[PDB]
mmCIF file of C-alpha atoms in Angstrom:
data_model
loop_
_atom_site.group_PDB
_atom_site.id
_atom_site.type_symbol
_atom_site.label_atom_id
_atom_site.label_comp_id
_atom_site.label_asym_id
_atom_site.label_seq_id
_atom_site.Cartn_x
_atom_site.Cartn_y
_atom_site.Cartn_z
ATOM 1 C CA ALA A 1 147.630 178.837 116.543
ATOM 2 C CA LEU A 2 147.512 178.361 112.818
ATOM 3 C CA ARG A 3 143.746 176.061 114.045
ATOM 4 C CA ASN A 4 142.042 179.913 115.713
ATOM 5 C CA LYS A 5 142.968 181.466 111.981
ATOM 6 C CA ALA A 6 139.138 180.690 109.711
ATOM 7 C CA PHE A 7 141.100 181.065 106.644
ATOM 8 C CA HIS A 8 143.836 178.540 107.255
ATOM 9 C CA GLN A 9 140.271 175.889 109.392
ATOM 10 C CA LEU A 10 138.873 177.101 105.429
ATOM 11 C CA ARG A 11 141.983 175.646 103.740
ATOM 12 C CA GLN A 12 141.727 172.521 106.016
ATOM 13 C CA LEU A 13 137.839 171.874 104.590
ATOM 14 C CA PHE A 14 139.190 172.269 101.262
ATOM 15 C CA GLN A 15 141.855 170.154 100.417
ATOM 16 C CA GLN A 16 140.263 167.308 102.503
ATOM 17 C CA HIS A 17 138.045 167.874 99.307
ATOM 18 C CA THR A 18 140.390 168.057 96.932
ATOM 19 C CA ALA A 19 141.661 164.843 98.904
ATOM 20 C CA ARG A 20 138.633 162.720 98.568
ATOM 21 C CA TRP A 21 137.408 163.712 94.926
ATOM 22 C CA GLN A 22 141.514 163.096 94.049
ATOM 23 C CA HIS A 23 140.557 159.918 95.658
ATOM 24 C CA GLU A 24 137.706 159.456 93.614
ATOM 25 C CA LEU A 25 138.026 161.027 90.554
ATOM 26 C CA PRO A 26 141.220 160.915 90.162
ATOM 27 C CA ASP A 27 140.695 161.273 86.216
ATOM 28 C CA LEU A 28 138.089 164.663 87.007
ATOM 29 C CA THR A 29 139.573 167.724 89.074
ATOM 30 C CA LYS A 30 136.570 170.237 90.303
ATOM 31 C CA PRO A 31 137.910 172.853 87.903
ATOM 32 C CA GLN A 32 136.893 170.398 85.084
ATOM 33 C CA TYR A 33 134.032 168.732 86.606
ATOM 34 C CA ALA A 34 132.308 172.106 87.251
ATOM 35 C CA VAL A 35 133.394 173.407 83.430
ATOM 36 C CA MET A 36 132.037 170.311 81.937
ATOM 37 C CA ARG A 37 128.440 170.727 83.891
ATOM 38 C CA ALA A 38 128.492 174.576 82.580
ATOM 39 C CA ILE A 39 128.975 172.773 79.246
ATOM 40 C CA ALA A 40 126.616 170.772 79.787
ATOM 41 C CA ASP A 41 123.378 173.298 81.084
ATOM 42 C CA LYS A 42 124.297 175.708 78.302
ATOM 43 C CA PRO A 43 126.015 173.759 75.316
ATOM 44 C CA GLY A 44 127.750 176.040 73.391
ATOM 45 C CA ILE A 45 129.106 178.023 75.193
ATOM 46 C CA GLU A 46 131.342 181.072 74.562
ATOM 47 C CA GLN A 47 134.767 179.297 76.062
ATOM 48 C CA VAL A 48 135.370 182.814 78.152
ATOM 49 C CA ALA A 49 131.832 182.648 79.880
ATOM 50 C CA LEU A 50 133.286 179.048 81.785
ATOM 51 C CA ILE A 51 135.440 181.151 83.492
ATOM 52 C CA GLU A 52 133.245 181.354 86.482
ATOM 53 C CA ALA A 53 132.271 178.127 86.861
ATOM 54 C CA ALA A 54 136.306 177.310 87.102
ATOM 55 C CA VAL A 55 136.776 180.079 88.743
ATOM 56 C CA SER A 56 139.957 180.214 87.173
ATOM 57 C CA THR A 57 142.247 182.740 84.340
ATOM 58 C CA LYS A 58 141.486 182.938 81.216
ATOM 59 C CA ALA A 59 145.130 181.076 80.961
ATOM 60 C CA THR A 60 144.238 178.152 83.186
ATOM 61 C CA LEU A 61 141.004 177.682 81.320
ATOM 62 C CA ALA A 62 142.427 177.633 78.075
ATOM 63 C CA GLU A 63 145.236 174.599 79.700
ATOM 64 C CA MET A 64 142.175 173.112 80.970
ATOM 65 C CA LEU A 65 140.356 172.882 77.447
ATOM 66 C CA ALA A 66 142.584 172.500 75.228
ATOM 67 C CA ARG A 67 143.871 168.965 77.973
ATOM 68 C CA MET A 68 140.034 168.509 77.497
ATOM 69 C CA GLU A 69 139.788 168.410 73.697
ATOM 70 C CA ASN A 70 142.905 166.473 73.300
ATOM 71 C CA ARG A 71 141.246 163.701 75.816
ATOM 72 C CA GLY A 72 137.834 163.168 73.517
ATOM 73 C CA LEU A 73 135.908 164.996 76.783
ATOM 74 C CA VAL A 74 134.808 168.332 74.805
ATOM 75 C CA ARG A 75 134.481 170.391 71.678
ATOM 76 C CA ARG A 76 135.102 173.854 70.299
ATOM 77 C CA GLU A 77 133.727 176.102 67.733
ATOM 78 C CA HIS A 78 135.459 179.208 66.348
ATOM 79 C CA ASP A 79 133.228 182.789 65.910
ATOM 80 C CA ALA A 80 134.014 183.000 62.081
ATOM 81 C CA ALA A 81 134.742 186.837 62.296
ATOM 82 C CA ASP A 82 137.186 186.469 65.587
ATOM 83 C CA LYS A 83 138.285 182.745 66.182
ATOM 84 C CA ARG A 84 139.668 183.727 69.534
ATOM 85 C CA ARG A 85 136.004 183.473 70.574
ATOM 86 C CA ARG A 86 135.245 179.677 71.013
ATOM 87 C CA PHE A 87 132.200 177.924 71.901
ATOM 88 C CA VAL A 88 132.257 174.816 73.156
ATOM 89 C CA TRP A 89 129.990 171.612 73.832
ATOM 90 C CA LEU A 90 130.853 168.671 75.476
ATOM 91 C CA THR A 91 130.705 165.170 73.192
ATOM 92 C CA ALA A 92 129.187 162.240 73.086
ATOM 93 C CA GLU A 93 132.231 160.726 75.668
ATOM 94 C CA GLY A 94 131.464 164.066 77.938
ATOM 95 C CA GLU A 95 128.232 163.260 78.669
ATOM 96 C CA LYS A 96 129.192 159.581 79.786
ATOM 97 C CA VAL A 97 132.212 160.935 82.019
ATOM 98 C CA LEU A 98 130.065 164.077 83.371
ATOM 99 C CA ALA A 99 126.643 161.344 83.643
ATOM 100 C CA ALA A 100 128.951 158.551 85.566
ATOM 101 C CA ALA A 101 131.139 161.974 87.819
ATOM 102 C CA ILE A 102 127.517 163.907 89.067
ATOM 103 C CA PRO A 103 127.079 161.132 92.045
ATOM 104 C CA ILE A 104 129.922 160.405 92.475
ATOM 105 C CA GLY A 105 130.854 164.144 93.376
ATOM 106 C CA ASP A 106 127.506 164.831 95.133
ATOM 107 C CA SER A 107 128.283 161.613 97.406
ATOM 108 C CA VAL A 108 131.779 163.580 98.026
ATOM 109 C CA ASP A 109 130.152 166.505 99.121
ATOM 110 C CA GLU A 110 128.002 164.386 101.469
ATOM 111 C CA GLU A 111 130.652 163.314 103.652
ATOM 112 C CA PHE A 112 131.221 166.709 105.163
ATOM 113 C CA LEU A 113 127.610 168.299 104.786
ATOM 114 C CA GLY A 114 126.053 165.085 105.324
ATOM 115 C CA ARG A 115 127.414 166.348 109.082
ATOM 116 C CA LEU A 116 125.568 169.255 109.394
ATOM 117 C CA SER A 117 121.459 169.831 109.308
ATOM 118 C CA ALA A 118 119.890 170.904 106.221
ATOM 119 C CA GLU A 119 119.968 174.241 108.157
ATOM 120 C CA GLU A 120 123.971 173.752 109.145
ATOM 121 C CA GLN A 121 124.626 173.747 105.555
ATOM 122 C CA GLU A 122 121.895 176.056 104.493
ATOM 123 C CA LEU A 123 123.301 178.979 106.688
ATOM 124 C CA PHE A 124 126.741 178.156 105.926
ATOM 125 C CA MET A 125 125.968 179.095 102.609
ATOM 126 C CA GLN A 126 124.984 182.838 103.552
ATOM 127 C CA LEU A 127 128.086 182.609 105.497
ATOM 128 C CA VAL A 128 130.266 182.387 102.100
ATOM 129 C CA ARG A 129 128.281 184.809 100.205
ATOM 130 C CA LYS A 130 127.759 187.283 102.610
ATOM 131 C CA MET A 131 132.068 187.348 102.609
ATOM 132 C CA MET A 132 132.169 187.125 98.994
ATOM 133 C CA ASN A 133 129.263 189.828 98.352
ATOM 134 C CA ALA B 1 123.442 175.730 88.984
ATOM 135 C CA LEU B 2 126.483 175.505 90.333
ATOM 136 C CA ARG B 3 125.716 178.266 92.686
ATOM 137 C CA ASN B 4 123.948 175.934 94.299
ATOM 138 C CA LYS B 5 126.316 173.565 94.747
ATOM 139 C CA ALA B 6 127.728 174.629 99.479
ATOM 140 C CA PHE B 7 131.582 172.860 97.764
ATOM 141 C CA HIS B 8 131.816 175.115 94.251
ATOM 142 C CA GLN B 9 130.986 178.861 96.072
ATOM 143 C CA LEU B 10 133.368 177.253 99.123
ATOM 144 C CA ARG B 11 135.892 177.134 95.986
ATOM 145 C CA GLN B 12 134.593 180.530 94.793
ATOM 146 C CA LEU B 13 135.610 182.273 98.235
ATOM 147 C CA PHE B 14 139.101 180.461 98.768
ATOM 148 C CA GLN B 15 139.741 181.412 95.688
ATOM 149 C CA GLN B 16 139.109 185.366 96.009
ATOM 150 C CA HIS B 17 140.798 185.198 99.261
ATOM 151 C CA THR B 18 144.103 183.116 97.447
ATOM 152 C CA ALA B 19 144.021 185.672 94.463
ATOM 153 C CA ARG B 20 143.587 188.841 97.172
ATOM 154 C CA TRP B 21 146.764 187.459 98.780
ATOM 155 C CA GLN B 22 148.182 186.338 95.541
ATOM 156 C CA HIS B 23 148.154 190.734 95.084
ATOM 157 C CA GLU B 24 149.549 191.656 97.713
ATOM 158 C CA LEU B 25 151.800 189.293 98.847
ATOM 159 C CA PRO B 26 153.056 187.501 95.517
ATOM 160 C CA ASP B 27 156.298 186.150 96.374
ATOM 161 C CA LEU B 28 154.660 184.240 100.350
ATOM 162 C CA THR B 29 151.666 181.915 99.364
ATOM 163 C CA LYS B 30 149.985 181.065 102.092
ATOM 164 C CA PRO B 31 151.136 177.128 102.476
ATOM 165 C CA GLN B 32 154.797 179.377 103.357
ATOM 166 C CA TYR B 33 153.187 181.628 105.104
ATOM 167 C CA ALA B 34 150.947 178.483 107.484
ATOM 168 C CA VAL B 35 154.302 176.898 107.551
ATOM 169 C CA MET B 36 156.574 179.652 108.514
ATOM 170 C CA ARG B 37 153.931 180.596 111.136
ATOM 171 C CA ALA B 38 154.933 177.101 112.721
ATOM 172 C CA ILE B 39 158.120 177.809 112.729
ATOM 173 C CA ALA B 40 158.245 180.707 114.033
ATOM 174 C CA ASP B 41 155.948 179.463 117.037
ATOM 175 C CA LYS B 42 158.019 175.857 117.019
ATOM 176 C CA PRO B 43 161.589 176.459 116.255
ATOM 177 C CA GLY B 44 163.836 173.572 115.763
ATOM 178 C CA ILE B 45 159.772 171.845 114.553
ATOM 179 C CA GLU B 46 160.001 167.949 113.203
ATOM 180 C CA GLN B 47 159.673 168.721 109.028
ATOM 181 C CA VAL B 48 157.382 166.218 109.064
ATOM 182 C CA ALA B 49 155.267 167.737 111.692
ATOM 183 C CA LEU B 50 154.880 171.364 109.309
ATOM 184 C CA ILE B 51 152.946 168.797 107.358
ATOM 185 C CA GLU B 52 149.800 170.168 108.904
ATOM 186 C CA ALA B 53 150.586 173.872 108.802
ATOM 187 C CA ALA B 54 151.327 173.360 105.048
ATOM 188 C CA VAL B 55 147.890 171.350 104.470
ATOM 189 C CA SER B 56 150.164 169.181 101.641
ATOM 190 C CA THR B 57 152.159 165.403 101.173
ATOM 191 C CA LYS B 58 154.964 164.928 102.375
ATOM 192 C CA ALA B 59 156.768 165.530 99.216
ATOM 193 C CA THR B 60 154.755 169.048 98.073
ATOM 194 C CA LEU B 61 156.718 170.270 101.886
ATOM 195 C CA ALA B 62 160.205 168.695 100.326
ATOM 196 C CA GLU B 63 160.223 171.056 97.333
ATOM 197 C CA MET B 64 158.421 174.199 99.883
ATOM 198 C CA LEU B 65 161.115 174.275 102.003
ATOM 199 C CA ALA B 66 163.172 173.484 99.569
ATOM 200 C CA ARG B 67 162.784 176.438 97.686
ATOM 201 C CA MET B 68 162.226 178.214 101.275
ATOM 202 C CA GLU B 69 165.797 177.790 101.841
ATOM 203 C CA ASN B 70 167.199 178.221 99.288
ATOM 204 C CA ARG B 71 165.233 181.998 99.428
ATOM 205 C CA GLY B 72 167.538 182.291 102.240
ATOM 206 C CA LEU B 73 163.960 181.590 104.291
ATOM 207 C CA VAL B 74 164.790 178.551 106.053
ATOM 208 C CA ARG B 75 167.358 176.482 107.718
ATOM 209 C CA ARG B 76 167.337 173.354 108.328
ATOM 210 C CA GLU B 77 169.376 170.807 110.388
ATOM 211 C CA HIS B 78 169.634 166.877 109.600
ATOM 212 C CA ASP B 79 169.280 163.530 113.022
ATOM 213 C CA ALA B 80 172.543 162.583 113.067
ATOM 214 C CA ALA B 81 170.809 158.706 113.193
ATOM 215 C CA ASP B 82 168.470 159.355 110.111
ATOM 216 C CA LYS B 83 168.777 162.658 108.431
ATOM 217 C CA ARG B 84 165.818 162.721 106.797
ATOM 218 C CA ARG B 85 164.476 163.303 109.979
ATOM 219 C CA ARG B 86 165.184 167.094 109.698
ATOM 220 C CA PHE B 87 164.847 170.555 111.674
ATOM 221 C CA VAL B 88 163.485 173.615 110.675
ATOM 222 C CA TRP B 89 164.326 177.035 111.806
ATOM 223 C CA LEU B 90 163.765 180.425 110.516
ATOM 224 C CA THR B 91 166.637 182.322 109.551
ATOM 225 C CA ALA B 92 166.883 186.081 110.092
ATOM 226 C CA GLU B 93 165.895 187.345 107.358
ATOM 227 C CA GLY B 94 162.745 184.715 107.241
ATOM 228 C CA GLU B 95 161.583 185.932 110.633
ATOM 229 C CA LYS B 96 161.460 189.381 108.900
ATOM 230 C CA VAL B 97 159.518 188.651 106.374
ATOM 231 C CA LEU B 98 157.143 187.041 108.700
ATOM 232 C CA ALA B 99 156.888 190.025 110.672
ATOM 233 C CA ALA B 100 155.930 191.995 107.278
ATOM 234 C CA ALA B 101 153.411 189.298 105.884
ATOM 235 C CA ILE B 102 151.005 188.765 108.871
ATOM 236 C CA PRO B 103 149.565 192.184 109.243
ATOM 237 C CA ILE B 104 149.449 191.829 105.490
ATOM 238 C CA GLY B 105 148.210 188.587 105.417
ATOM 239 C CA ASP B 106 145.409 189.324 108.809
ATOM 240 C CA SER B 107 144.126 192.485 106.645
ATOM 241 C CA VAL B 108 143.864 190.126 103.520
ATOM 242 C CA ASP B 109 141.795 187.957 105.905
ATOM 243 C CA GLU B 110 139.430 190.966 107.134
ATOM 244 C CA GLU B 111 138.623 191.950 103.623
ATOM 245 C CA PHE B 112 136.016 189.126 103.868
ATOM 246 C CA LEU B 113 135.833 188.454 107.719
ATOM 247 C CA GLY B 114 134.780 192.084 108.174
ATOM 248 C CA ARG B 115 132.131 191.729 106.928
ATOM 249 C CA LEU B 116 130.714 189.098 108.816
ATOM 250 C CA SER B 117 129.723 189.521 112.280
ATOM 251 C CA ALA B 118 132.022 187.966 115.502
ATOM 252 C CA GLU B 119 129.066 185.432 116.306
ATOM 253 C CA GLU B 120 129.382 184.718 112.444
ATOM 254 C CA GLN B 121 132.888 184.725 112.342
ATOM 255 C CA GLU B 122 133.089 181.897 115.331
ATOM 256 C CA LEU B 123 130.585 180.643 113.798
ATOM 257 C CA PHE B 124 131.484 180.265 110.274
ATOM 258 C CA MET B 125 134.204 178.278 111.921
ATOM 259 C CA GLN B 126 131.946 175.882 114.159
ATOM 260 C CA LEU B 127 130.817 174.413 110.840
ATOM 261 C CA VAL B 128 133.885 173.870 108.830
ATOM 262 C CA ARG B 129 135.629 172.394 111.630
ATOM 263 C CA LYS B 130 131.842 169.966 111.999
ATOM 264 C CA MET B 131 131.993 169.123 108.275
ATOM 265 C CA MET B 132 135.822 167.843 108.840
ATOM 266 C CA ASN B 133 134.563 165.537 111.787
#
């Protein structure tokens, strides 16, 4: 049965967590949230570097960041040499939105991680990383 | 950092596995694949029951199954009483497509699960289920 497939149960969990995230933060997706935290950690980060936080393609990030700056959450500047290269900052509003979302996302994570001891959480992470090499 | 968030690393893994799936099976997504296996296990399954395999909403499943029968992969029949209620079978082609995809999907799963011992696989599953209650 599908319940016996590790990666099926994985999509079940990922979707349950995503669905809770959608209910609590309907206007800030997990990829948007992660991108914004990467920007807050490294203001002026090069736009291309943000695909790691976004776990997306260059195209999906382009569409994402365009939507985000149209919503006044981020601003961008270009390289005078190569205007494709772009740098990303949070706007004042973006910082406010991010500040409010962090404890919300943390608590959504906790709805699930809270069902595990500390040793089990650390060990769930070791397994995920081991499967990614 | 985001790498220290269990559910961020989880999306990293899920997307890596999804990206491999997309490369090997570009015409059969994981939700489509899971739905088809649920149909093959229970021919004539009620369409509503398939949201569990699809890990989706009723609407996403509707769009999915419509696309799948337009591609000749599944067929559907209606309840003479309540024609919203529908039953789903695989077509001959669908069975052929599913037969070919199973070993492909299994081997994609193995690219990741293969990096874990049997005890670690079973234990990754116990953790995922424990976080879903």
